[PDB]
């Protein structure tokens, strides 16, 4: 085994609880379906009170999912799909409604955008997420600047949360200076209120015992720490979490990505030639520099970005293992590994790029219209 | 003339502009009616851009009024009527709509109330203000916790204002510590957004050139300073102001009132016996201690609380002057002055107390329902 990364040491640092095989079988048991490879392969290794989301479900009780998205240049990439892919699965395997927050307000506050430019990006991004194919009959995608003024529960929760979070606390958590507009300072309450059922009357109509499940990155744990700590204090169930590992930066194993450097990740907007070239040229390699050496020494998957990407996007186990075994035994060359991955990414992105182009303004408009929606244990 | 108070020195300090006779005639001129005694007697001595509210009106253009009320124990008193009385007049003499904000959220944040206790007080207070008799066909009385989630303009303005007011600024203005919940820190945007027409689509529906008039106390000027400074920056007309003097505390000329000491002012809830006793026993006197001395020396009205109250509630000029002349010449005794005032307050309070008891939940519910309303230059 190579060095690469360490996630068992984080389970400590953050005080969260690791997702063991017992739990994995538990989900499978209650779901009546085969667990997602993210679980099987340890991509989503940690959690918080999933035991509760389950206790509820196994005891024939509902729960819902929450995901958010801040309107950016829309330069969305491959790593951004991990949480959506997973959440879509959690949704499908449990038949539970999903609320998705488009923080157009957060971006108006942070970026130099107009109020309309922000709402406008929230729409464009909504096309990307809808392309991931979430069941419209159970997914509500909302604009903050829009849904705030058309709900008898949201603001009331914002205010309740707002009273229980001092300024020092958020300073310590988000690091807000005194040069920051009062907008930013208060915002944590906005992205925290969607975690409570009654913030959505046209869905949970007044109900308060419908727990929330939030799949997220492990490092994001401190941020939901605030929301979970206030939950009881305002008479609500803390939202459970599902932690994921970091999605590797194209170059170097575990570097930081961004849209500033167009060569940090493959965008859901790149063509087959771009993906091909990007993977061949930039993906960090965990294989020897000499084919002779690469034959008896082989390569380590644990630091090879390419093989790591397969861990996320290769659906068939036997084939992923095969690549693993052969890349390691030297039998497979680094360029034959890039090829295998390029063969997986091009259709992934062409598929999303295609499936996206089929999103009609009516579909968008529908997805963002508050309304009743069906699901298990209603 | 006695010492008492000085308001021409404040016109300086705050940089506002004094309301001269030219202006007073101007209003009268444009209004086609006799100016309120508050104006005639210098109770509302200062202003900011009233010249603009007028330029608009004289040029056959509309403007609206804004007043607010934070839900308290409802221990409302006589001094609290001054702004409502005036605003009702401004409303009647110009036929312009009036928006009144019940900050139930501000109180949930500041007091140790439940979210429902706050909304509940906002309702009780709405009865008091409605008792002042505002024209329901042109007055909108709203609950913050309620109207936020049923408007396509309010929040958007809150966010716009929120981005343009840094934390240092409000620290410097309201004096917010770091121990304060993020709720309070952001609140200035909430009581500031009602100052812009488009915050009320069901009234000004999208329009942005309908200036706002805010009658207030002179010391409150620094607070609207923030709102007026950001107005242009978000493409809106600064709200004009009408400054009033301080309403004297029962004892001592110009002391601070409150509900903590039930003997600081007469409550709109006291009976005739309470008002009678309160005025005789507590009203500070500007008259000699000896009737012999009080005859040749007389008394000064400028420090006598009682005579000062007459300045606010005695409608007939000739009679107020008569009292003034006689109390000064010694001809009128301090107890005969208290009597004259007690004769003015009892009906004022019995009238409001009566007119209040006639406010039906339907009336309340109606006044707080967003809806279209008629007015001059619509």
XYZ file of C-alpha atoms in Angstrom:
756
model
C 0.000 0.000 0.000
C 1.168 3.528 -0.847
C 1.161 6.596 1.425
C -1.339 8.925 -0.235
C -3.965 9.974 2.346
C -5.168 9.202 5.892
C -8.852 9.443 6.814
C -8.926 7.465 10.066
C -6.978 10.251 11.761
C -9.682 12.765 10.791
C -12.449 10.640 12.337
C -10.587 11.570 15.513
C -9.835 15.254 14.975
C -13.474 16.061 14.131
C -14.974 13.674 16.676
C -17.258 12.173 14.026
C -18.012 8.446 13.786
C -16.612 6.077 11.116
C -18.880 4.146 8.727
C -18.074 0.490 9.414
C -19.232 -2.617 7.564
C -21.926 -3.247 10.185
C -23.506 0.105 9.312
C -23.044 -0.425 5.586
C -24.917 -3.731 5.853
C -27.485 -1.953 7.997
C -28.278 0.588 5.260
C -28.389 -2.167 2.639
C -30.595 -4.155 5.006
C -33.104 -1.300 5.456
C -32.861 -0.057 1.864
C -33.458 -3.392 0.189
C -30.780 -2.575 -2.367
C -27.061 -2.807 -3.012
C -25.062 0.024 -1.376
C -23.400 2.609 -3.632
C -19.731 2.094 -4.462
C -18.947 5.361 -2.623
C -19.874 3.435 0.514
C -18.362 0.098 -0.527
C -15.091 1.791 -1.501
C -14.890 4.059 1.523
C -15.421 7.298 -0.392
C -18.085 8.281 2.156
C -16.290 6.908 5.227
C -17.707 9.007 8.075
C -21.074 10.048 9.497
C -23.087 11.613 12.316
C -26.354 10.177 13.578
C -27.006 8.154 10.413
C -27.943 5.612 13.072
C -30.817 7.992 13.883
C -31.912 8.618 10.282
C -32.064 4.832 10.080
C -33.712 4.156 13.462
C -36.417 6.419 12.073
C -36.560 4.730 8.640
C -36.334 1.159 9.957
C -39.106 2.189 12.376
C -41.081 3.222 9.300
C -40.523 6.986 9.693
C -39.500 9.560 7.013
C -36.429 11.790 6.718
C -35.207 14.110 3.955
C -32.041 15.196 2.181
C -30.423 18.585 1.861
C -27.780 19.869 -0.560
C -26.847 23.412 -1.577
C -25.101 25.268 -4.390
C -23.722 28.798 -4.533
C -24.140 30.419 -7.995
C -20.690 30.753 -9.557
C -19.343 31.274 -13.069
C -20.867 27.795 -13.450
C -17.369 26.478 -14.120
C -18.552 23.282 -12.427
C -16.322 20.243 -12.519
C -16.152 16.485 -12.070
C -15.479 16.708 -8.346
C -18.698 18.672 -7.901
C -20.746 15.652 -9.026
C -19.664 13.429 -6.142
C -22.207 14.816 -3.649
C -25.007 15.059 -6.215
C -24.380 11.552 -7.539
C -24.494 10.207 -3.968
C -27.527 12.235 -2.877
C -29.395 11.153 -5.986
C -28.696 7.581 -4.926
C -29.713 8.155 -1.284
C -32.829 9.685 -2.711
C -33.592 6.751 -5.009
C -32.774 3.990 -2.515
C -34.943 5.511 0.253
C -37.540 7.453 -1.756
C -37.149 10.638 0.334
C -37.608 14.283 -0.794
C -34.540 16.436 -1.510
C -34.240 20.189 -0.919
C -31.477 22.049 -2.794
C -30.531 25.599 -1.901
C -29.224 27.971 -4.535
C -27.561 30.677 -2.495
C -27.983 33.514 -5.001
C -27.975 35.868 -2.007
C -24.669 34.550 -0.696
C -23.115 35.435 -4.058
C -24.622 38.876 -4.311
C -23.045 39.521 -0.906
C -19.647 37.988 -1.691
C -19.170 38.674 -5.385
C -19.446 41.926 -7.328
C -22.711 40.902 -8.970
C -26.023 42.637 -9.450
C -29.008 41.204 -7.622
C -30.317 39.911 -10.960
C -26.963 38.488 -12.059
C -26.982 36.322 -8.942
C -30.507 34.989 -9.404
C -29.518 34.485 -13.012
C -26.597 32.232 -12.073
C -28.772 30.332 -9.625
C -30.862 29.411 -12.654
C -27.913 28.358 -14.833
C -26.560 26.195 -12.031
C -30.013 24.654 -11.564
C -29.651 23.290 -15.080
C -26.401 21.550 -14.186
C -27.808 19.906 -11.079
C -31.049 18.910 -12.820
C -28.908 17.268 -15.515
C -27.733 14.848 -12.806
C -31.303 13.603 -13.075
C -32.995 14.062 -9.693
C -36.614 12.892 -9.488
C -38.617 16.080 -10.047
C -41.611 14.610 -8.178
C -39.524 14.736 -4.972
C -36.821 17.396 -5.359
C -37.312 21.107 -4.555
C -34.630 23.463 -5.904
C -34.902 26.957 -4.481
C -33.511 30.423 -4.905
C -32.873 32.139 -1.539
C -33.706 35.604 -2.889
C -36.923 34.082 -4.175
C -38.176 31.549 -1.633
C -37.603 33.812 1.344
C -40.581 35.994 0.426
C -42.904 33.073 -0.314
C -42.767 30.850 2.745
C -44.348 31.057 6.187
C -41.551 29.043 7.746
C -38.136 29.929 6.323
C -37.568 33.393 7.755
C -39.048 32.395 11.102
C -36.335 29.736 11.283
C -33.650 32.158 10.123
C -34.618 34.490 12.987
C -34.720 31.638 15.520
C -31.290 30.445 14.491
C -30.076 34.069 14.271
C -30.840 34.632 17.972
C -28.884 31.578 19.085
C -25.642 32.193 17.230
C -23.479 34.981 18.637
C -21.094 36.986 16.547
C -17.996 35.587 18.297
C -19.081 32.057 17.437
C -19.337 32.664 13.687
C -16.195 34.792 13.823
C -14.439 31.765 15.281
C -16.054 29.421 12.749
C -16.152 31.360 9.451
C -13.610 34.022 10.362
C -15.643 37.169 9.741
C -13.782 40.482 10.023
C -15.414 43.761 11.141
C -14.978 45.101 7.602
C -17.656 42.620 6.451
C -21.143 43.786 5.536
C -23.838 42.764 8.004
C -25.144 40.609 5.173
C -22.326 38.053 5.327
C -22.318 38.023 9.140
C -25.945 36.921 9.253
C -25.817 34.520 6.299
C -24.886 31.382 8.275
C -28.515 31.363 9.455
C -29.750 31.288 5.848
C -27.837 28.171 4.788
C -28.644 26.586 8.123
C -32.420 27.023 8.123
C -33.033 24.649 5.232
C -31.990 21.877 7.648
C -35.319 22.032 9.452
C -38.500 20.499 8.114
C -40.864 23.375 8.935
C -38.750 25.768 6.838
C -40.666 24.057 4.031
C -44.433 24.119 4.776
C -45.418 23.219 1.206
C -43.610 19.924 1.825
C -43.439 19.093 5.515
C -46.238 21.536 6.358
C -45.557 22.419 10.016
C -44.082 19.002 10.910
C -40.958 19.151 13.061
C -39.828 15.555 13.615
C -38.628 14.866 10.061
C -34.854 14.663 10.469
C -32.502 15.965 7.786
C -29.621 14.128 6.114
C -26.789 16.186 4.707
C -24.184 14.472 2.568
C -21.029 16.646 2.564
C -17.245 16.752 2.543
C -15.576 15.737 5.801
C -13.762 19.059 6.270
C -17.149 20.841 6.109
C -18.080 19.202 9.412
C -17.161 22.231 11.540
C -19.684 24.309 9.565
C -22.663 22.026 10.207
C -21.356 21.889 13.809
C -23.117 25.231 14.394
C -26.424 24.083 12.924
C -26.322 20.789 14.869
C -25.473 22.522 18.170
C -28.437 24.941 17.943
C -30.929 22.343 16.661
C -32.050 21.104 20.103
C -31.968 24.615 21.575
C -34.753 25.642 19.196
C -36.591 22.375 19.678
C -35.495 20.480 16.549
C -33.589 17.286 15.646
C -29.932 17.884 14.701
C -29.330 17.192 10.996
C -27.325 13.994 10.390
C -24.226 14.037 8.178
C -22.432 11.759 5.693
C -18.784 12.730 5.217
C -16.887 12.135 1.991
C -13.159 12.163 1.360
C -11.545 14.870 -0.755
C -11.818 14.608 -4.511
C -8.174 14.670 -5.742
C -6.824 17.607 -7.718
C -5.714 16.607 -11.224
C -2.017 17.052 -10.438
C -0.470 15.699 -7.262
C -2.426 13.402 -4.953
C -4.763 15.548 -2.823
C -4.059 19.120 -3.991
C -6.613 21.959 -3.978
C -8.734 22.587 -7.079
C -10.445 25.684 -8.472
C -11.557 27.291 -11.738
C -8.695 29.799 -11.545
C -6.372 27.185 -13.057
C -8.254 25.447 -15.932
C -5.903 22.505 -15.419
C -6.865 21.516 -11.877
C -9.816 19.362 -12.877
C -11.951 18.303 -15.840
C -14.985 20.532 -16.276
C -18.465 19.201 -17.025
C -18.029 21.538 -19.967
C -14.878 20.098 -21.590
C -14.940 18.122 -24.841
C -13.572 14.646 -25.432
C -10.359 16.114 -26.840
C -9.952 18.344 -23.779
C -10.633 15.492 -21.352
C -8.279 13.197 -23.276
C -5.447 15.731 -23.372
C -6.094 16.906 -19.800
C -5.832 13.395 -18.346
C -2.781 12.375 -20.398
C -0.881 15.596 -19.725
C -1.900 16.672 -16.202
C -3.108 13.700 -14.131
C -0.375 12.965 -11.591
C 1.148 9.496 -12.102
C 1.908 6.880 -9.475
C 3.972 4.862 -11.916
C 7.716 4.569 -12.577
C 9.551 6.806 -15.052
C 11.010 3.870 -16.996
C 8.935 1.149 -18.652
C 11.583 -1.365 -17.626
C 11.272 -0.228 -14.005
C 7.499 0.121 -14.332
C 7.436 -3.585 -15.201
C 9.054 -5.131 -12.131
C 8.253 -2.292 -9.708
C 4.834 -1.347 -11.041
C 2.912 1.652 -9.813
C 0.950 2.563 -6.697
C -2.685 3.484 -7.147
C -2.894 5.351 -3.846
C -1.078 8.394 -5.252
C -1.945 8.061 -8.936
C -4.705 10.578 -9.570
C -6.015 8.635 -12.568
C -6.608 5.406 -10.667
C -8.143 7.499 -7.917
C -10.671 8.970 -10.324
C -11.645 5.418 -11.344
C -12.430 4.822 -7.687
C -15.224 7.405 -8.123
C -16.484 6.796 -11.653
C -15.877 3.137 -12.552
C -19.096 1.303 -11.706
C -17.990 -2.329 -12.253
C -15.938 -3.629 -9.319
C -14.118 -6.526 -11.005
C -12.751 -4.129 -13.621
C -11.572 -1.547 -11.106
C -9.807 -4.244 -9.124
C -8.304 -5.687 -12.311
C -6.822 -2.283 -13.149
C -5.644 -1.971 -9.565
C -3.945 -5.361 -9.592
C -2.338 -4.874 -13.022
C -1.180 -1.287 -12.522
C 0.429 -2.469 -9.302
C 1.982 -5.626 -10.762
C 3.420 -3.489 -13.558
C 1.348 -5.407 -16.117
C -0.515 -2.173 -16.929
C 1.327 0.931 -18.088
C 0.523 4.452 -16.912
C -0.698 5.439 -20.388
C -3.030 2.447 -20.557
C -4.443 3.564 -17.192
C -5.058 7.115 -18.446
C -6.837 5.626 -21.450
C -9.119 3.500 -19.284
C -10.064 6.614 -17.269
C -10.473 8.809 -20.351
C -12.856 6.132 -21.603
C -14.927 6.591 -18.437
C -14.910 10.425 -18.267
C -15.834 11.339 -21.848
C -19.189 9.544 -21.757
C -19.834 10.819 -18.207
C -19.400 14.391 -19.344
C -20.999 13.966 -22.771
C -23.945 12.335 -21.002
C -24.350 15.210 -18.528
C -23.702 17.767 -21.258
C -26.429 16.119 -23.321
C -28.883 15.463 -20.521
C -28.390 19.131 -19.558
C -29.246 20.535 -22.988
C -32.655 18.897 -22.496
C -33.621 21.057 -19.526
C -36.459 23.352 -20.554
C -37.194 26.668 -18.869
C -40.483 24.994 -17.898
C -38.598 22.194 -16.169
C -36.395 24.720 -14.368
C -39.383 26.871 -13.477
C -41.151 23.753 -12.242
C -38.281 22.420 -10.098
C -38.084 25.797 -8.337
C -41.811 26.143 -7.669
C -42.754 25.329 -4.097
C -45.282 22.511 -4.158
C -46.350 19.263 -2.507
C -44.285 16.191 -3.419
C -44.598 12.439 -2.747
C -42.271 10.031 -0.954
C -41.978 7.004 1.349
C -43.627 7.181 4.781
C -45.644 10.308 4.000
C -38.519 83.495 28.750
C -37.293 80.615 30.924
C -34.269 78.363 30.326
C -35.812 74.940 29.744
C -34.506 73.534 26.431
C -32.501 74.524 23.330
C -33.318 73.066 19.912
C -31.514 75.511 17.620
C -28.187 74.152 18.849
C -29.195 70.634 17.761
C -30.027 71.785 14.220
C -26.276 72.373 14.156
C -24.927 69.257 15.858
C -26.922 66.927 13.579
C -26.486 69.027 10.443
C -30.228 68.898 9.752
C -32.219 71.883 8.471
C -34.664 73.969 10.562
C -38.356 74.288 9.646
C -38.875 78.021 9.118
C -42.098 79.944 8.539
C -41.448 80.021 4.785
C -41.545 76.216 4.727
C -44.538 76.061 7.050
C -46.459 78.341 4.680
C -45.193 76.211 1.814
C -46.752 73.034 3.247
C -49.986 74.885 4.013
C -49.853 76.312 0.497
C -49.499 72.874 -1.148
C -51.788 71.078 1.309
C -54.708 73.462 1.035
C -55.239 73.226 4.780
C -54.180 74.750 8.075
C -50.860 73.357 9.389
C -50.913 71.207 12.536
C -50.136 72.924 15.832
C -47.027 70.711 16.151
C -45.678 72.751 13.248
C -47.142 76.100 14.315
C -45.794 75.656 17.851
C -42.386 74.364 16.827
C -42.893 70.844 18.167
C -41.657 69.475 14.827
C -38.923 72.074 14.267
C -36.450 70.260 12.005
C -36.410 68.319 8.738
C -34.436 66.744 5.897
C -35.451 67.022 2.262
C -39.078 67.888 3.054
C -38.358 70.371 0.275
C -38.064 67.293 -1.967
C -41.202 65.522 -0.713
C -42.916 68.804 -1.545
C -41.203 69.497 -4.892
C -42.647 66.112 -5.803
C -46.129 66.821 -4.381
C -46.370 70.388 -5.704
C -45.266 68.907 -9.050
C -48.219 66.542 -8.705
C -46.179 63.480 -7.657
C -46.864 60.998 -4.791
C -44.849 60.143 -1.676
C -45.611 57.947 1.342
C -45.190 57.831 5.105
C -43.394 55.365 7.319
C -43.649 54.727 11.063
C -42.659 51.704 13.146
C -43.409 50.118 16.511
C -41.522 47.471 18.466
C -43.855 45.106 20.402
C -43.431 45.820 24.112
C -45.444 45.119 27.255
C -47.796 47.550 25.487
C -47.281 49.952 28.382
C -47.704 52.713 25.799
C -47.968 56.284 26.981
C -49.004 59.808 26.052
C -45.623 60.681 24.576
C -45.940 57.761 22.169
C -48.945 59.414 20.492
C -47.014 62.452 19.279
C -45.609 60.758 16.155
C -48.832 58.886 15.382
C -50.988 61.979 15.858
C -48.697 63.912 13.494
C -48.387 61.149 10.893
C -52.147 60.708 10.882
C -52.381 64.406 10.080
C -49.687 64.286 7.368
C -51.632 61.387 5.989
C -54.970 63.212 6.013
C -53.681 66.543 4.687
C -51.835 64.935 1.740
C -53.853 61.744 1.190
C -50.751 59.504 1.037
C -50.436 55.820 2.085
C -48.790 54.942 5.414
C -46.711 51.832 6.143
C -46.248 50.844 9.806
C -43.716 48.235 10.842
C -44.316 46.054 13.868
C -40.871 44.730 14.659
C -41.962 41.484 16.327
C -38.632 40.033 15.184
C -36.612 42.791 16.826
C -38.268 41.879 20.132
C -37.799 38.157 19.809
C -34.104 38.937 19.327
C -33.811 41.469 22.159
C -36.295 40.240 24.739
C -36.706 36.803 26.302
C -39.891 36.082 24.367
C -41.083 33.129 22.350
C -41.515 33.638 18.628
C -45.289 33.556 19.147
C -45.226 35.903 22.141
C -43.578 38.510 19.927
C -46.053 38.220 17.062
C -48.705 38.275 19.748
C -47.523 41.637 21.084
C -47.277 43.015 17.567
C -51.009 42.362 17.368
C -51.848 43.985 20.716
C -49.838 47.058 19.780
C -51.616 47.185 16.412
C -54.811 47.783 18.357
C -53.316 50.805 20.093
C -52.097 52.398 16.883
C -55.339 51.641 15.029
C -57.187 53.363 17.887
C -55.432 56.575 16.802
C -57.737 56.231 13.814
C -55.601 55.893 10.678
C -57.517 55.565 7.404
C -57.616 51.809 6.798
C -58.034 52.356 3.037
C -54.474 53.758 2.962
C -52.529 52.355 5.926
C -50.650 49.019 5.891
C -49.607 47.670 9.305
C -47.218 44.749 9.056
C -45.576 42.102 11.162
C -41.914 41.549 10.181
C -42.015 37.832 11.013
C -45.088 37.653 8.811
C -44.600 39.979 5.845
C -41.065 38.827 5.145
C -42.284 35.511 3.737
C -45.066 37.051 1.647
C -43.417 39.757 -0.423
C -41.281 39.700 -3.557
C -39.563 42.934 -2.612
C -38.827 43.172 1.112
C -36.064 40.608 1.526
C -34.431 41.648 -1.735
C -34.110 45.127 -0.234
C -32.888 43.761 3.092
C -30.108 41.919 1.232
C -29.237 44.979 -0.874
C -28.992 47.166 2.193
C -27.204 44.354 4.077
C -24.353 44.355 1.533
C -23.778 48.094 1.823
C -23.572 48.411 5.590
C -20.380 47.071 7.152
C -20.203 45.759 10.663
C -17.955 48.604 11.877
C -20.516 51.148 10.716
C -23.405 49.690 12.722
C -21.052 49.048 15.632
C -20.279 52.759 15.577
C -23.956 53.672 15.175
C -25.889 51.183 17.346
C -22.974 49.998 19.461
C -23.152 46.252 18.856
C -20.793 44.081 20.914
C -19.343 40.753 19.695
C -21.465 38.957 22.299
C -24.563 39.876 20.248
C -26.405 37.269 18.208
C -26.033 37.663 14.452
C -29.737 38.462 14.505
C -29.350 41.885 16.128
C -26.296 42.744 14.013
C -28.264 42.332 10.798
C -31.520 43.887 12.018
C -30.745 47.487 10.988
C -31.432 46.338 7.415
C -34.913 45.139 8.406
C -36.127 48.445 9.854
C -34.431 50.270 7.012
C -35.955 48.400 4.073
C -39.482 49.654 4.669
C -38.159 53.066 3.565
C -38.143 52.015 -0.076
C -41.246 51.849 -2.222
C -40.520 48.529 -3.951
C -40.318 46.763 -0.570
C -44.103 46.933 -0.924
C -45.171 45.562 -4.350
C -48.832 45.206 -3.356
C -48.815 48.995 -2.963
C -46.100 50.606 -5.053
C -45.722 47.508 -7.238
C -42.132 47.780 -8.528
C -42.091 51.608 -8.581
C -38.903 53.165 -7.232
C -39.360 56.943 -7.413
C -41.945 57.258 -4.628
C -40.004 59.006 -1.867
C -40.593 58.181 1.793
C -41.364 60.588 4.636
C -40.417 59.552 8.137
C -41.637 61.641 11.044
C -39.373 60.932 14.053
C -37.651 62.315 17.126
C -34.683 64.584 16.440
C -32.191 62.426 18.358
C -33.142 59.472 16.114
C -31.549 61.289 13.179
C -28.240 59.404 13.394
C -30.145 56.129 12.914
C -31.860 57.142 9.670
C -28.435 58.559 8.692
C -27.446 55.008 7.679
C -30.559 54.420 5.589
C -30.242 57.827 3.876
C -26.530 57.328 3.104
C -27.095 53.954 1.375
C -30.261 55.023 -0.481
C -28.484 56.438 -3.559
C -25.890 53.652 -3.547
C -28.648 51.125 -4.242
C -30.366 53.431 -6.695
C -33.130 54.874 -4.491
C -34.251 58.281 -3.152
C -33.135 58.974 0.438
C -36.111 59.023 2.827
C -36.951 62.537 4.079
C -37.321 63.232 7.804
C -39.405 65.431 10.129
C -37.769 65.889 13.534
C -39.742 66.464 16.718
C -38.566 67.762 20.068
C -38.480 65.514 23.125
C -41.722 64.826 24.933
C -41.052 65.931 28.556
C -40.883 63.404 31.375
C -43.592 63.971 33.993
C -41.128 65.192 36.623
C -38.413 67.698 35.810
C -38.336 69.488 32.460
C -36.832 67.116 29.867
C -36.056 63.944 31.857
C -36.079 60.408 30.415
C -39.275 58.343 30.567
C -39.949 54.601 30.639
C -42.442 52.019 31.906
C -40.019 50.940 34.642
C -41.215 53.859 36.779
C -45.050 54.051 36.485
C -44.736 57.714 37.449
C -42.710 58.990 34.497
C -45.681 59.543 32.214
C -49.434 59.009 31.912
C -50.272 55.733 30.201
C -52.957 55.397 27.532
C -54.209 52.840 30.021
C -54.663 55.009 33.140
C -58.076 56.045 34.464
C -59.298 59.561 35.136
C -58.413 59.201 38.817
C -54.898 58.031 37.930
C -54.371 60.842 35.418
C -55.760 63.398 37.877
C -53.573 62.221 40.755
C -50.534 61.693 38.509
C -50.624 65.250 37.151
C -51.303 66.912 40.518
C -48.649 64.923 42.371
C -45.854 64.326 39.832
C -45.897 66.961 37.067
C -42.918 69.240 37.694
C -44.004 72.827 38.448
C -42.578 76.034 37.033
C -44.404 78.116 39.606
C -43.369 79.702 42.916
C -43.657 77.883 46.249
C -45.715 80.657 47.861
C -49.041 81.917 46.522
C -48.014 85.425 47.534
C -44.800 85.073 45.522
C -46.619 83.212 42.750
C -48.796 86.312 42.376
C -46.210 88.995 41.637
C -43.511 86.669 40.266
C -45.746 84.195 38.464
C -44.447 81.028 36.890
C -42.468 80.122 33.784
C -44.099 77.776 31.314
C -40.811 76.743 29.721
C -39.932 74.428 32.621
C -43.411 73.586 33.895
C -44.173 70.116 32.577
C -47.930 70.689 32.765
C -47.934 73.757 30.533
C -45.594 71.881 28.230
C -48.085 69.054 27.853
C -50.733 71.626 26.866
C -48.381 72.645 24.077
C -48.973 69.147 22.636
C -52.613 68.431 23.450
C -54.495 71.745 23.641
C -55.979 72.307 20.187
C -57.345 75.868 20.591
C -54.576 78.472 20.329
C -56.250 81.408 22.097
C -56.798 79.233 25.166
C -53.238 77.933 25.279
C -51.911 81.466 25.012
C -54.361 82.653 27.673
C -53.036 80.008 30.068
C -49.506 80.969 29.093
C -50.094 84.660 29.737
C -51.937 84.108 33.036
C -49.611 81.463 34.469
C -46.765 83.851 33.718
C -48.478 86.964 35.090
C -49.241 85.010 38.259
C -52.978 85.357 37.598
C -53.199 81.559 37.255
C -52.087 79.254 40.051
C -50.125 76.047 39.518
C -53.077 73.931 40.680
C -55.431 75.656 38.250
C -52.925 74.834 35.491
C -52.818 71.146 36.464
C -56.612 71.129 36.378
C -56.728 72.606 32.882
C -54.314 69.889 31.681
C -56.113 67.097 33.539
C -59.237 68.285 31.738
C -57.444 67.751 28.418
C -55.797 64.366 29.170
C -58.731 62.409 30.613
C -60.866 62.719 27.478
C -57.804 62.098 25.267
C -57.124 58.828 27.023
C -60.760 57.837 27.546
C -61.300 58.525 23.845
C -58.368 56.333 22.772
C -59.268 53.709 25.361
C -62.795 53.665 23.958
C -61.903 53.898 20.292
C -59.472 51.022 20.950
C -62.062 48.686 22.470
C -63.838 48.922 19.103
C -61.039 47.258 17.149
C -62.239 43.870 15.938
C -59.917 40.984 15.133
C -61.268 41.403 11.589
C -60.130 45.021 11.536
C -56.705 44.016 12.855
C -56.488 41.116 10.429
C -57.510 43.479 7.646
C -55.023 46.261 8.473
C -52.197 43.701 8.387
C -53.197 42.077 5.098
C -51.070 43.211 2.184
C -53.357 44.727 -0.426
C -53.783 47.572 -2.905
C -54.793 50.929 -1.408
C -55.863 54.307 -2.847
C -54.321 57.760 -2.495
C -53.527 61.082 -4.195
C -51.440 61.023 -7.384
C -51.747 57.267 -7.892
